[PDB]
Design a protein around this motif. Structure first.
Motif, PDB file in Angstrom:
ATOM      1  N   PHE A  79       1.329  -0.436  -0.845  1.00  0.00           N
ATOM      2  CA  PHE A  79       0.157  -0.105  -1.650  1.00  0.00           C
ATOM      3  C   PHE A  79      -0.422  -1.374  -2.245  1.00  0.00           C
ATOM      4  CE2 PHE A  79      -2.199   3.132  -4.069  1.00  0.00           C
ATOM      5  CZ  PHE A  79      -2.715   2.381  -5.112  1.00  0.00           C
ATOM      6  N   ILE A  80       0.429  -2.107  -2.945  1.00  0.00           N
ATOM      7  CA  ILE A  80       0.026  -3.329  -3.629  1.00  0.00           C
ATOM      8  C   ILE A  80      -0.443  -4.423  -2.644  1.00  0.00           C
ATOM      9  CG2 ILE A  80       0.932  -5.229  -5.044  1.00  0.00           C
ATOM     10  CD1 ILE A  80       2.594  -2.961  -6.526  1.00  0.00           C
ATOM     11  N   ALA A  81       0.284  -4.622  -1.549  1.00  0.00           N
ATOM     12  CA  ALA A  81      -0.132  -5.590  -0.530  1.00  0.00           C
ATOM     13  C   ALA A  81      -1.483  -5.214   0.021  1.00  0.00           C
ATOM     14  CB  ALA A  81       0.865  -5.641   0.602  1.00  0.00           C
ATOM     15  N   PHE A  87      -9.216  -6.823  -1.540  1.00  0.00           N
ATOM     16  CA  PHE A  87      -9.812  -7.937  -2.300  1.00  0.00           C
ATOM     17  C   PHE A  87     -10.149  -9.154  -1.410  1.00  0.00           C
ATOM     18  CE2 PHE A  87      -8.880 -11.947  -4.630  1.00  0.00           C
ATOM     19  CZ  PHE A  87      -9.902 -11.953  -5.559  1.00  0.00           C
ATOM     20  N   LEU A  88      -9.233  -9.523  -0.522  1.00  0.00           N
ATOM     21  CA  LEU A  88      -9.425 -10.650   0.383  1.00  0.00           C
ATOM     22  C   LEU A  88     -10.277 -10.255   1.571  1.00  0.00           C
ATOM     23  CD1 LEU A  88      -5.672 -11.403   0.049  1.00  0.00           C
ATOM     24  CD2 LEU A  88      -7.392 -13.080  -0.524  1.00  0.00           C
ATOM     25  N   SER A  89     -10.537  -8.955   1.758  1.00  0.00           N
ATOM     26  CA  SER A  89     -11.064  -8.456   3.016  1.00  0.00           C
ATOM     27  C   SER A  89     -12.294  -9.239   3.406  1.00  0.00           C
ATOM     28  CB  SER A  89     -11.425  -6.971   2.951  1.00  0.00           C
ATOM     29  OG  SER A  89     -12.476  -6.752   2.025  1.00  0.00           O
ATOM     30  N   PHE A  92     -15.837  -5.638   6.821  1.00  0.00           N
ATOM     31  CA  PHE A  92     -15.658  -4.198   6.592  1.00  0.00           C
ATOM     32  C   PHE A  92     -14.506  -3.613   7.450  1.00  0.00           C
ATOM     33  CE2 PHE A  92     -16.384   0.248   7.306  1.00  0.00           C
ATOM     34  CZ  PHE A  92     -16.592   0.727   6.024  1.00  0.00           C
ATOM     35  N   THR A  93     -14.197  -4.260   8.572  1.00  0.00           N
ATOM     36  CA  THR A  93     -13.060  -3.890   9.408  1.00  0.00           C
ATOM     37  C   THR A  93     -11.753  -4.126   8.696  1.00  0.00           C
ATOM     38  OG1 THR A  93     -14.360  -4.653  11.305  1.00  0.00           O
ATOM     39  CG2 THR A  93     -12.033  -4.145  11.690  1.00  0.00           C
ATOM     40  N   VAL A  94     -11.601  -5.334   8.160  1.00  0.00           N
ATOM     41  CA  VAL A  94     -10.406  -5.699   7.398  1.00  0.00           C
ATOM     42  C   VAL A  94     -10.265  -4.765   6.205  1.00  0.00           C
ATOM     43  CG1 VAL A  94      -9.283  -7.461   5.945  1.00  0.00           C
ATOM     44  CG2 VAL A  94     -10.405  -8.132   8.093  1.00  0.00           C
ATOM     45  N   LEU A  95     -11.378  -4.435   5.549  1.00  0.00           N
ATOM     46  CA  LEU A  95     -11.348  -3.516   4.418  1.00  0.00           C
ATOM     47  C   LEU A  95     -10.668  -2.219   4.859  1.00  0.00           C
ATOM     48  CD1 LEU A  95     -14.315  -2.429   2.036  1.00  0.00           C
ATOM     49  CD2 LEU A  95     -12.023  -1.492   2.162  1.00  0.00           C
ATOM     50  N   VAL A  96     -11.210  -1.598   5.894  1.00  0.00           N
ATOM     51  CA  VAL A  96     -10.743  -0.279   6.320  1.00  0.00           C
ATOM     52  C   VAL A  96      -9.300  -0.268   6.908  1.00  0.00           C
ATOM     53  CG1 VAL A  96     -12.129  -0.339   8.458  1.00  0.00           C
ATOM     54  CG2 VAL A  96     -11.303   1.836   7.595  1.00  0.00           C
ATOM     55  N   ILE A  97      -8.925  -1.362   7.575  1.00  0.00           N
ATOM     56  CA  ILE A  97      -7.526  -1.643   7.969  1.00  0.00           C
ATOM     57  C   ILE A  97      -6.587  -1.572   6.759  1.00  0.00           C
ATOM     58  CG2 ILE A  97      -5.973  -3.590   8.528  1.00  0.00           C
ATOM     59  CD1 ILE A  97      -7.173  -2.755  11.100  1.00  0.00           C
ATOM     60  N   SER A  98      -7.048  -2.166   5.660  1.00  0.00           N
ATOM     61  CA  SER A  98      -6.364  -2.125   4.387  1.00  0.00           C
ATOM     62  C   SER A  98      -6.253  -0.691   3.876  1.00  0.00           C
ATOM     63  CB  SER A  98      -7.104  -2.986   3.374  1.00  0.00           C
ATOM     64  OG  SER A  98      -6.412  -2.998   2.154  1.00  0.00           O
ATOM     65  N   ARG A  99      -7.330   0.076   4.027  1.00  0.00           N
ATOM     66  CA  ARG A  99      -7.333   1.495   3.638  1.00  0.00           C
ATOM     67  C   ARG A  99      -6.287   2.324   4.375  1.00  0.00           C
ATOM     68  NH1 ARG A  99      -9.143   1.814  -1.200  1.00  0.00           N
ATOM     69  NH2 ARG A  99      -9.464   4.055  -0.833  1.00  0.00           N
ATOM     70  N   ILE A 100      -5.982   1.950   5.608  1.00  0.00           N
ATOM     71  CA  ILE A 100      -4.924   2.618   6.358  1.00  0.00           C
ATOM     72  C   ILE A 100      -3.579   2.301   5.738  1.00  0.00           C
ATOM     73  CG2 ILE A 100      -3.697   2.770   8.588  1.00  0.00           C
ATOM     74  CD1 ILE A 100      -6.433   2.092   9.903  1.00  0.00           C
ATOM     75  N   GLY A 101      -3.392   1.029   5.403  1.00  0.00           N
ATOM     76  CA  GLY A 101      -2.192   0.585   4.722  1.00  0.00           C
ATOM     77  C   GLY A 101      -1.951   1.482   3.529  1.00  0.00           C
ATOM     78  N   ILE A 161      -2.691  -4.107  -9.430  1.00  0.00           N
ATOM     79  CA  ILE A 161      -1.869  -4.522 -10.568  1.00  0.00           C
ATOM     80  C   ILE A 161      -1.241  -3.330 -11.321  1.00  0.00           C
ATOM     81  CG2 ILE A 161      -1.809  -5.849 -12.712  1.00  0.00           C
ATOM     82  CD1 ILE A 161      -4.318  -7.405 -11.421  1.00  0.00           C
ATOM     83  N   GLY A 162      -1.996  -2.246 -11.448  1.00  0.00           N
ATOM     84  CA  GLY A 162      -1.478  -1.021 -12.061  1.00  0.00           C
ATOM     85  C   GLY A 162      -0.227  -0.599 -11.332  1.00  0.00           C
ATOM     86  N   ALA A 163      -0.360  -0.511 -10.007  1.00  0.00           N
ATOM     87  CA  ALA A 163       0.734  -0.122  -9.161  1.00  0.00           C
ATOM     88  C   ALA A 163       1.934  -0.974  -9.488  1.00  0.00           C
ATOM     89  CB  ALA A 163       0.364  -0.235  -7.712  1.00  0.00           C
ATOM     90  N   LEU A 164       1.735  -2.266  -9.680  1.00  0.00           N
ATOM     91  CA  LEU A 164       2.838  -3.121 -10.124  1.00  0.00           C
ATOM     92  C   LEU A 164       3.376  -2.728 -11.522  1.00  0.00           C
ATOM     93  CD1 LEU A 164       3.062  -6.878  -9.353  1.00  0.00           C
ATOM     94  CD2 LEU A 164       4.000  -5.952 -11.482  1.00  0.00           C
ATOM     95  N   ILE A 165       2.570  -2.832 -12.573  1.00  0.00           N
ATOM     96  CA  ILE A 165       3.126  -2.555 -13.917  1.00  0.00           C
ATOM     97  C   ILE A 165       3.819  -1.183 -13.943  1.00  0.00           C
ATOM     98  CG2 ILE A 165       1.163  -3.858 -14.932  1.00  0.00           C
ATOM     99  CD1 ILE A 165       0.485  -1.396 -16.602  1.00  0.00           C
ATOM    100  N   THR A 166       3.325  -0.247 -13.139  1.00  0.00           N
ATOM    101  CA  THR A 166       3.930   1.068 -13.052  1.00  0.00           C
ATOM    102  C   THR A 166       5.154   1.057 -12.169  1.00  0.00           C
ATOM    103  OG1 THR A 166       2.470   1.505 -11.255  1.00  0.00           O
ATOM    104  CG2 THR A 166       1.806   2.325 -13.378  1.00  0.00           C
ATOM    105  N   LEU A 167       5.127   0.262 -11.106  1.00  0.00           N
ATOM    106  CA  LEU A 167       6.320  -0.003 -10.287  1.00  0.00           C
ATOM    107  C   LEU A 167       7.461  -0.543 -11.150  1.00  0.00           C
ATOM    108  CD1 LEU A 167       6.306  -2.272  -7.099  1.00  0.00           C
ATOM    109  CD2 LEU A 167       8.323  -1.532  -8.386  1.00  0.00           C
ATOM    110  N   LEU A 168       7.140  -1.443 -12.082  1.00  0.00           N
ATOM    111  CA  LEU A 168       8.173  -2.044 -12.925  1.00  0.00           C
ATOM    112  C   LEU A 168       8.674  -1.019 -13.933  1.00  0.00           C
ATOM    113  CD1 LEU A 168       6.946  -5.703 -13.348  1.00  0.00           C
ATOM    114  CD2 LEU A 168       8.056  -4.646 -11.365  1.00  0.00           C
TER     115      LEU A 168
END
Ligand SMILES: CCCCCCCCCO[C@@H]1O[C@H](CO)[C@@H](O)[C@H](O)[C@H]1O
Ligand SMILES: CCCCCCCCCO[C@@H]1O[C@H](CO)[C@@H](O)[C@H](O)[C@H]1O
Ligand SMILES: CC(C)S[C@@H]1O[C@H](CO)[C@H](O)[C@H](O)[C@H]1O
Length: 366
Positions: A79-81, A87-89, A92-101, A161-168
């Motif tokens: 999720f976090i990765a 953010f780095l995408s 728009f392809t890289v964006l949506v690839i990320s959405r699959i992640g 970042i939420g996912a992180l602070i909540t992961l912790l």
């Protein structure tokens, strides 16, 4: 520890469900950065959704063999990765690839979340649902305002970042199918869900470029409606909380009826700020009543295999989102994006009938 070990998940549900709908308040921005048109970017919703549809069942299958808090970590990590990739995408392809992640984590999460709330025990499910509920009210609205000042990439990085602070927060607190296919009432509920969701996501997906490109109002006014809908949702959610343990049939049908109205009256109530706004007040109230209406009934109907109930619920819910996004996309691209309200009102009519039919057929509950 119970309340915490569960409020942490309730938060966690807020994150995943917050993420998938944030694009609704970010279509213009995302489009601008990638030199495409608003509706074209709408497909990242379908891609997300349909990956969650395809994988909700097979992923949980493979994943349930080995299913510790370990699994939540690897969700969250991925999720976090993925959110970092958005953010780095660099296309728009890289964006949506990320959405699959994200969708891969999404898929797995929402199979599991149903049980875990119970395994820390109940009414652990309201908490989860409250989080689910508080996504439309605080999550998505505030995600827009952030995407306003800061833009869409920061919005995506923020969530990571939420996912992180909540992961912790998470790490500090640690330790079949044919029967359902043969419950027509459950199936009928799985059916009603798919349909009614497509109706709503035909319109709701594109509400932003609707309020901007089509109804003419300010990008502030759009953001205004999104807040109103969320809070409208609170009313809706607390109508149910207090009155959905009975009256479930009647509420849900009248809700779906209300939804019908709103969807038809989208274009006529536009050019009337107050009008669209009220529309929003009713639309929102319907949205949550219908939304929680089904979750509650599936769980009711599937006590012996709730999570598989929910695994199916998850997937079959996401067919409707991709369905509605895609049909909403296609009407917007090919005939006019004004007809999104009307097109969506067709699946909503059907659902009203199907609603009334099956509640007549299976009045049994509780
Ligand atoms: C058959 C008539 C349709 C009525 C609805 C009943 C539920 C069956 C829909 O299947 C969907 O397709 C995915 C593909 O793998 C599966 O993961 C998963 O079952 C589900 O999301
Ligand atoms: C005349 C009697 C009415 C009762 C039938 C129940 C309505 C079921 C229709 O669902 C269909 O499923 C698709 C998703 O797969 C939708 O996208 C499609 O638009 C819709 O047509
Ligand atoms: C429209 C949102 C509630 S998304 C929806 O929530 C459901 C119950 O909370 C299911 O668990 C699905 O997996 C999830 O995608």
């Amino acid at each position: 520890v119970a309340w915490l070990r569960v409020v942490t998940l309730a938060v966690a549900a807020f994150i995943f469900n917050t993420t998938e709908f944030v694009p609704v308040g970010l279509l213009s921005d995302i489009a601008q950065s990638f030199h495409m048109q608003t509706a074209q970017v709408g497909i990242m919703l379908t891609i997300y959704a349909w990956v969650v549809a395809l994988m909700s069942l097979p992923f949980m299958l493979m994943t349930s063999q080995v299913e510790r808090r370990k699994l939540l970590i690897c969700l969250f990590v991925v999720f976090i990765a993925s959110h970092v990739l958005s953010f780095l995408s660099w296309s728009f392809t890289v964006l949506v690839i990320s959405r699959i992640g994200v969708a891969f984590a999404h898929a797995i999460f929402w199979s599991i979340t149903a049980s875990l709330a119970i395994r820390m025990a109940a009414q652990a499910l309201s908490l989860i649902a409250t989080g689910t509920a508080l996504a439309m009210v605080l999550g998505l609205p505030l995600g827009r305002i952030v995407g306003q000042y800061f833009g869409w990439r920061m919005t995506f990085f923020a969530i990571g970042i939420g996912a992180l602070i909540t992961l912790l927060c998470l790490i500090k607190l640690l330790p079949s199918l044919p029967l359902l296919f043969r419950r027509p009432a459950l199936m009928s509920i799985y059916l009603l869900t798919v349909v009614v969701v497509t109706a709503h996501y035909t319109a709701y997906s594109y509400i932003e470029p609707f309020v901007q490109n089509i109804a003419g109002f300010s990008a502030n006014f759009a953001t205004a409606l999104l807040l109103l809908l969320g809070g409208a949702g609170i009313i809706g959610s607390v109508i149910f909380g207090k009155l959905g343990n009975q009256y479930a049939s009647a509420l849900v049908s009248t809700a779906i009826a209300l939804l019908l109205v709103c969807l038809a009256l989208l274009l006529p109530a536009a050019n009337s700020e107050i009008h669209l706004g009220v529309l929003s007040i009713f639309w929102g109230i319907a949205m949550m009543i219908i939304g929680l209406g089904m979750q509650v009934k599936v769980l009711a109907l599937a006590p012996d295999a709730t999570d598989v109930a929910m695994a199916l619920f998850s997937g079959i819910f996401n067919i409707g989102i991709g369905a509605g996004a895609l049909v909403g996309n296609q009407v917007s691209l090919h005939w006019s994006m004004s007809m999104i309200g009307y097109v969506g009102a067709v699946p909503a009519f059907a659902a009203l009938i199907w609603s009334i039919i099956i509640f007549r057929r299976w009045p049994v509950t509780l």
